[PDB]
């Protein structure tokens, strides 16, 4: 089920390569160490409502 099972546990982009999940992130995010979470590079990352 891979990317079809709950987005493969990816925060953002899920791609199936061979028979496994590969995660990635929009521009302005980097993939965390766990290979799933997307971490913002700088202030005002895309897609985030603003709080200050």
């Amino acid at each position: 089920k891979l990317c079809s099972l709950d987005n493969g546990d990816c925060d953002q982009f899920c791609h199936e390569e061979q028979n496994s999940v590969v995660c990635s992130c929009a521009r302005g995010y980097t993939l965390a160490d766990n290979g799933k979470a997307c971490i913002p590079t700088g202030p005002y990352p895309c897609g985030k409502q603003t709080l200050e």
Binding site: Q12, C14, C46
Partner: protein, 233 residues
């Protein structure tokens, strides 16, 4: 926007507004980056000279977050057709970069396959704008947003008195009276995924606004992601 709610502080920060020489909003756009605004090609015909306002929520008042930006380049999709509104997409490159701040920030561009498979199969997207609050009303002085169901493509085609091309999709409600309307055009349709908002559409056209048995028609952004990329150089 018909129905829906005001965008509250911070909630629709990728909203842009194309303003005419009279300083009056005629269409929306979406912030894509410090330099680029996404809008509808049919909007380029609403005014000879226009600018982009970002950071606005209430046109009646100065909140201090507003910024007017001159347009440097208009990049119209060359295949755009006024008769069908097929290829209803344009990107604007700004003279001066947008300074992101409260109420000013870009929406994310998704990758095509993931977006079509995961975003566009969600229950809802969010459309927003300063457009008319009913078919025959005046434009809103408040930025509004509205949650709009993705509509099954075959029902949408059955609904419609006009052609729905591979570059369009439908969203909104069968009879419930909530819809985008005149002046929302070129504005954001975004899809939320784990608290991150991705551009999925551009407000394009409808048969009226919120008419029974009719849907909102949107430019299918995921069909133009390589085109958008090239445009943003």
């Amino acid at each position: 926007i018909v129905g829906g709610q005001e965008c509250k502080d911070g909630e629709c920060p990728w909203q842009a507004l194309l303003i005419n020489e009279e300083n009056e909003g005629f269409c929306g756009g979406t912030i894509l980056s410090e330099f680029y605004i996404l809008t509808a090609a049919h909007c380029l015909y609403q005014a000879k000279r226009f600018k982009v306002r970002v950071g606005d929520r209430n046109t009646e008042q100065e909140e201090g977050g507003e910024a007017v930006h001159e347009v440097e380049v208009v990049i119209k999709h060359n295949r755009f057709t006024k008769e069908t509104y097929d290829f209803d997409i344009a990107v604007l490159r700004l003279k001066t970069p947008i300074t992101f701040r409260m109420n000013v920030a870009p929406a994310c561009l998704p990758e095509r396959d993931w977006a079509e498979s995961t975003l566009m199969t969600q229950k809802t997207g969010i459309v927003s704008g300063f457009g008319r609050t009913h078919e025959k009303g005046r434009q809103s002085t408040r930025l509004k947003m509205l949650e709009v169901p993705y509509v099954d493509r075959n029902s949408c085609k059955l609904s419609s008195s006009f052609i729905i091309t591979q570059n369009m999709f439908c969203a909104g409600y069968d009879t419930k009276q909530e819809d985008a309307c005149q002046g929302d055009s070129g504005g954001p349709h975004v899809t939320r995924f784990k608290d991150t908002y991705f551009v999925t559409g551009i407000v394009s056209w409808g048969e009226g606004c919120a008419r029974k048995g009719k849907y909102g028609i949107y430019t299918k952004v995921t069909a133009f992601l390589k085109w958008i990329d090239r445009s943003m150089k």
